[PDB]
Amino acid sequence: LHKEPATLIKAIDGDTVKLMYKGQPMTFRLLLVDTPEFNEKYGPEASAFHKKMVENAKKIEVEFDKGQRTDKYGRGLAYEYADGKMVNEALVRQGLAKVAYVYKGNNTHEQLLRKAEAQAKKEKLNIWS
Ligand SMILES: Cc1cn([C@H]2C[C@H](OP(=O)(O)O)[C@@H](COP(=O)(O)O)O2)c(=O)[nH]c1=O
Ligand SMILES: [Ca+2]
């Protein structure tokens, strides 16, 4: 897998964001995770966390997996990195997302994310409190 450049257009919520990629505005949905919706418990905090992580970054990158790159809603499916740190893994590690939506052929970072989830759960963080 390869990291590709993108720039932030706008924060949306815990697991979606508007980025510019190859010079086109796209909504990205983060692979392998599920954040609560904004109206649900920990939704606000998931949104804030994702927002902060990407607004503070100097360099956003997106990494596509081996499978489909866009979902049925036209959202880009990627791992997102903020100054080299994966946003998908960070949300899970903080108990602000669950590992989810693990489809065959787009699951390269499954086990990395599951390890983060086990550690968030041990610590009783947020969703696991
Ligand atoms: C993360 C992800 C979601 N989706 C689709 C599945 C779900 O369809 P449904 O809309 O039919 O429930 C939806 C979940 O996204 P959200 O959690 O953003 O709603 O997005 C994919 O198709 N591929 C993916 O990798
Ligand atoms: Ca969601």
The breaks in the chain (C to N more than 2.5 Å) occur after: none
Give the structural domain span for 129: 1-129
Handedness of CA 21, 25, 31, 33 (dihedral sign): positive
Give this entry's resolution in angstroms: 1.8
Residue with CA nearest ligand 1 atom 6 = 101
Ligand 1: centre distance to CA 28 (Å): 11
Q: What is the CATH number of the domain that holds 66?
A: 2.40.50.90
Bridge partners of residue 26, in order along the sequence? 19
As for how many domains the chain has, the answer is 1
83 is in an annotated binding site: no
Backbone phi, then psi, for 123, in 5-degree steps? -75, -5
- What kind of experiment solved this structure? X-ray
Residue with CA nearest ligand 1 atom 16 = 34
**Residue 16: DSSP 8-state:** E
Q: Which residues participate in catalysis according to the annotation? A: 29, 37, 75
Q: For every residue of 49-98, which 3-state class applies, written as one string?
A: HHHHHHHCCCCEEEECCCCCCECCCCCEEEEEEECCEEHHHHHHHCCCCE
35 is in an annotated binding site: yes
Q: Rounded to a whole number, what is the distance in angstroms from the first to the last CA of the chain?
A: 34
User: Do 61 and 109 meet the contact criterion of CB atoms below 8 Å apart?
Assistant: no
